[PDB]
Amino acid sequence: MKAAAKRISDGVYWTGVLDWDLRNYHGYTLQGTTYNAYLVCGDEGVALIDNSYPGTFDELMARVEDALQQVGMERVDYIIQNHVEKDHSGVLVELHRRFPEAPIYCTEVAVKGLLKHYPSLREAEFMTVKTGDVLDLGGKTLTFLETPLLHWPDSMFTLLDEDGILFSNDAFGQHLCCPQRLDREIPEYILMDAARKFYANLITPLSKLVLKKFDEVKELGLLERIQMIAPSHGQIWTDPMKIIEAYTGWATGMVDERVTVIYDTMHGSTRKMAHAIAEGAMSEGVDVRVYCLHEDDRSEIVKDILESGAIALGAPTIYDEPYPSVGDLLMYLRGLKFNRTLTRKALVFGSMGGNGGATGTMKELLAEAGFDVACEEEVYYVPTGDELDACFEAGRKLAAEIR
Amino acid sequence: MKAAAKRISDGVYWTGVLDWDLRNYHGYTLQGTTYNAYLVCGDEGVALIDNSYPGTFDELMARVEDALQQVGMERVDYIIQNHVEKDHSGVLVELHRRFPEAPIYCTEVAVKGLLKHYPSLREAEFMTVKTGDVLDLGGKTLTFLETPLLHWPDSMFTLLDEDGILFSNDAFGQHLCCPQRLDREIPEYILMDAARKFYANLITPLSKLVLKKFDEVKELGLLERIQMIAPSHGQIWTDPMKIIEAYTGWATGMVDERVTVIYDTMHGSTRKMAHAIAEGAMSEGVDVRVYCLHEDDRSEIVKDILESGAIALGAPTIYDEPYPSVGDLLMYLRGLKFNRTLTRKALVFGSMGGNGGATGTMKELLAEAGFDVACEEEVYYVPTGDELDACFEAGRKLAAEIR
Numbered sequence: 001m002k003a004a005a006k007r008i009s010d011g012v013y014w015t016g017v018l019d020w021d022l023r024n025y026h027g028y029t030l031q032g033t034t035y036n037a038y039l040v041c042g043d044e045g046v047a048l049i050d051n052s053y054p055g056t057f058d059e060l061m062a063r064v065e066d067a068l069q070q071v072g073m074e075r076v077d078y079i080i081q082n083h084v085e086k087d088h089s090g091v092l093v094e095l096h097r098r099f100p101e102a103p104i105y106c107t108e109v110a111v112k113g114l115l116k117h118y119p120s121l122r123e124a125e126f127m128t129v130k131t132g133d134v135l136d137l138g139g140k141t142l143t144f145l146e147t148p149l150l151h152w153p154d155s156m157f158t159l160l161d162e163d164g165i166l167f168s169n170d171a172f173g174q175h176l177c178c179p180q181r182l183d184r185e186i187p188e189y190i191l192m193d194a195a196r197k198f199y200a201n202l203i204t205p206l207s208k209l210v211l212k213k214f215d216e217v218k219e220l221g222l223l224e225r226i227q228m229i230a231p232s233h234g235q236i237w238t239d240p241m242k243i244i245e246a247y248t249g250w251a252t253g254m255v256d257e258r259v260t261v262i263y264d265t266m267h268g269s270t271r272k273m274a275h276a277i278a279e280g281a282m283s284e285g286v287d288v289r290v291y292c293l294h295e296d297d298r299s300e301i302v303k304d305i306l307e308s309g310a311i312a313l314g315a316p317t318i319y320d321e322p323y324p325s326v327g328d329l330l331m332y333l334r335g336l337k338f339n340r341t342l343t344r345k346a347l348v349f350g351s352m353g354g355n356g357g358a359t360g361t362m363k364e365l366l367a368e369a370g371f372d373v374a375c376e377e378e379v380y381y382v383p384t385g386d387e388l389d390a391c392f393e394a395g396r397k398l399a400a401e402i403r
Numbered sequence: 404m405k406a407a408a409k410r411i412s413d414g415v416y417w418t419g420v421l422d423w424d425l426r427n428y429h430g431y432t433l434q435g436t437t438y439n440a441y442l443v444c445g446d447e448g449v450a451l452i453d454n455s456y457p458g459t460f461d462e463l464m465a466r467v468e469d470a471l472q473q474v475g476m477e478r479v480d481y482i483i484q485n486h487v488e489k490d491h492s493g494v495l496v497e498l499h500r501r502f503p504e505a506p507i508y509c510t511e512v513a514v515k516g517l518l519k520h521y522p523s524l525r526e527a528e529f530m531t532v533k534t535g536d537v538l539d540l541g542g543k544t545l546t547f548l549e550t551p552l553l554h555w556p557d558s559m560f561t562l563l564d565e566d567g568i569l570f571s572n573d574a575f576g577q578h579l580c581c582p583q584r585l586d587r588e589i590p591e592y593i594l595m596d597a598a599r600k601f602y603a604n605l606i607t608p609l610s611k612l613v614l615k616k617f618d619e620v621k622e623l624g625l626l627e628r629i630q631m632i633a634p635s636h637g638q639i640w641t642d643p644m645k646i647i648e649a650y651t652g653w654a655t656g657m658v659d660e661r662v663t664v665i666y667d668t669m670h671g672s673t674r675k676m677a678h679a680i681a682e683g684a685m686s687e688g689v690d691v692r693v694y695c696l697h698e699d700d701r702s703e704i705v706k707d708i709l710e711s712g713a714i715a716l717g718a719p720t721i722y723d724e725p726y727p728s729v730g731d732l733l734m735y736l737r738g739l740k741f742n743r744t745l746t747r748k749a750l751v752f753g754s755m756g757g758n759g760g761a762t763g764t765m766k767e768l769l770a771e772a773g774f775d776v777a778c779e780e781e782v783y784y785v786p787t788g789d790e791l792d793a794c795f796e797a798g799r800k801l802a803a804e805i806r
């Protein structure tokens with residue numbers, strides 16, 4: 001099969017795979033992604049940093065063969081596993097069948113992970129590594145740095161001292177499938193928005209660890225030496241500081257003035273309420289997004305919550321409880337824990353036909369999710385003009401509060 | 404406009420609307436529904452029991468005009484509203500305008516709900532009814548029976564006793580849109596399964612109030628006459644004891660031997676677990692259903708739950724929580740309160756890669772939802788052969804418990 005490797009420095013090649021067709025990656029929507037694997041070529045040997053999703057071996061392999069072609073090398077000598085997740089380890093056993101001599105390099109925890117996933121790796125040689133440990137390839141040294149919970153217990157970064165490339169696994173990744181491999185080669189909106197989404201859905205609960213890990217990279221004195229950041233998804237950062245600055249901002253809760261309005265509805269009244277709240281917030285010169293849970297994915301919603309100082313979540317009440325779709329978002333938000341960056345303000349609202357109770361349940365679940373809920377707007381059936389005025393007011397107050 | 408009315412008894416005609424297009428009625432999936440209005444004509448006056456969704460007046464009005472020409476009467480003399488909900492009250496403004504003399508007949512609570520929906524009816528003549536009240540039509544008499552929380556606070560039945568016909572509104576309804584009007588005129592599998600899904604999604608939490616309502620009609624000496632049930636959705640029950648006996652089974656929790664397996668997954672490990680649980684259930688000769696939350700609607704899932712003695716719920720853990728899709732089903736289950744029919748047995752399972760926590764949360768939330776849930780199957784990453792043997796055993800044991 002014909003697929004070319006892409007040279008990113010002297011002796012360092014991208015040799016991953018392009019997944020044009022992926023549209024839904026475990027409850028995360030996208031327009032394709034890539035699985036980035038990299039081949040590092042020293043004097044004495046070559047290392048393969050990560051691999052790809054199962055079934056994609058032929059493509060990965062064509063690319064490494066092409067890169068072994070150009071450097072005049074014979075084989076992969078070392079297989080590095082930054083991370084155990086399926087999309088980066090999925091062809092590890094094909095790799096081990098193709099290069100029988102090559103040890104697998106990973107953290108002590110990852111070896112349990114890897115043996116659980118693919119038991120046929122029972123008599124593979126595993127070299128355990130921890131922070132500080134080095135792999136010398138000849139004029140090229142690989143330094144390992146353990147990153148537990150960023151984003152899994154098993155994970156680590158590999159650093160290549162001479163080229164200043166940080167191989168970061170999921171960290172700094174973005175889900176985008178372009179023919180261009182570098183950050184500077186595509187629209188920056190598209191780049192930064194995919195990066196933002198990745199952060200909102202995957203890094204948000206890790207935010208404090210993100211910050212501390214920045215310090216520990218600084219304390220070891222490794223930030224000066226970082227000239228390129230090569231994650232396992234999406235674009236390679238030829239401007240590492242662009243994304244580090246963005247991650248720092250997201251982790252410390254920066255945000256411009258913005259209210260995210262989220263709702264569901266059966267008969268429209270809560271929709272009417274949602275609209276008036278949006279108008280109110282709009283009156284204060286604040287940015288305003290409106291989401292409907294019947295239509296909109298939670299990964300797209302959460303991407304805006306990240307850049308929002310406040311939200312308004314509304315739903316009608318059915319048999320004492322909120323409309324169930326709201327239960328999906330709130331469970332997700334209880335995992336993501338936005339309070340770890342910023343305790344965002346929240347308005348809770350809805351229409352109801354009797355005793356109600358949707359606003360009560362949403363309050364509790366918003367609190368446990370780390371939102372500060374002040375006031376609610378509860379309407380009996382279709383809101384009158386004056387009731388829609390009160391939603392306008394609530395919308396405006398919420399916005400003024402975060403100005 | 405040409406739309407003909409249907410004689411269902413002497414002086415009694417269906418005059419509803421056929422909604423072929425509806426596919427989604429507030430999170431309830433269907434292949435069309437109907438809005439049944441009934442024209443009831445005595446020797447002195449004519450009553451119109453209920454109406455239809457907003458914007459569908461010309462269709463309803465066409466049918467009521469056919470029924471009028473057919474039966475030889477001039478216009479509608481009384482407007483009857485059993486339910487305030489807009490699929491049955493959506494053209495009441497256009498009926499009050501078309502018949503500016505015809506009083507609106509509803510309960511006390513309905514009036515507040517109907518004025519809030521349509522502020523225009525402020526200067527309309529309301530004729531407030533309660534249980535035992537009669538509207539004499541000249542030879543035919545209507546008897547009004549209140550049914551609060553059955554389905555709504557403002558709900559009521561209208562009866563015809565010298566004729567034994569129950570106008571039950573949402574009760575005994577089914578979301579079907581068929582050219583045929585009667586229960587007997589369409590396959591009973593289709594009929595009953597419709598009626599099943601309608602009970603499961605709409606009547607379940609009302610179960611105990613359905614048995615007491617049967618006790619009350621029997622105490623007032625009215626049900627041992629029953630010839631026909633005429634609901635506001637779907638087929639007219641010419642065999643009313645079939646749906647009344649089914650409703651009795653559903654409210655007391657009768658069920659055949661059946662387990663329902665429900666799960667979500669990201670990488671397929673929880674899926675391998677669900678399939679093994681199902682195999683185990685199957686080894687006991689019990690009926691089995693298997694739903695994935697990524698694909699399947701909550702109204703379909705719940706329909707099978709109604710006919711199941713036991714369920715299994717599985718999900719991988721994601722940031723210390725179960726897969727978010729679970730939160731939607733659990734919040735919906737929490738409102739349906741299946742424990743008012745039968746405390747069903749439950750099995751909680753799922754794969755994880757660290758500390759877990761999903762199955763602890765599901766065990767907790769399912770018990771809140773009225774299920775009796777002992778035992779979780781928790782697997783680290785990909786389940787081994789023995790771990791799937793263990794899942795098989797869990798499903799078998801769940802299955803044997805309900806035999």
Ligand SMILES: Cc1cc2nc3c(=O)[nH]c(=O)nc-3n(C[C@H](O)[C@H](O)[C@H](O)COP(=O)(O)O)c2cc1C
Pocket residue numbers: 264265266267268269270271315316317318319320321351352353354355356357380381382429
């Ligand atoms: C399935 C069904 C059950 C309901 N149960 C309740 C309830 O328990 N308590 C309540 O206050 N309203 C209940 N409602 C009434 C609605 O909450 C009310 O009509 C509300 O205004 C709907 O707002 P929406 O237009 O945004 O859908 C129920 C409505 C339906 C459709």
Ligand SMILES: Cc1cc2nc3c(=O)[nH]c(=O)nc-3n(C[C@H](O)[C@H](O)[C@H](O)COP(=O)(O)O)c2cc1C
Pocket residue numbers: 667668669670671672673674718719720721722723724754755756757758759760783784785
């Ligand atoms: C987004 C992400 C976050 C995760 N967070 C946790 C965690 O909180 N705790 C844990 O035990 N596992 C966590 N997991 C690991 C999954 O539970 C594990 O990979 C599991 O095998 C998935 O099961 P499945 O194959 O059925 O999707 C996480 C996985 C992903 C991809």
Ligand SMILES: [Fe+3]
Pocket residue numbers: 083085151152170
């Ligand atoms: Fe990952």
Ligand SMILES: [Fe+3]
Pocket residue numbers: 085087088170232233
């Ligand atoms: Fe990844």
Ligand SMILES: [Fe+3]
Pocket residue numbers: 486488554573
């Ligand atoms: Fe209704």
Ligand SMILES: [Fe+3]
Pocket residue numbers: 488490491573635636
């Ligand atoms: Fe209805």
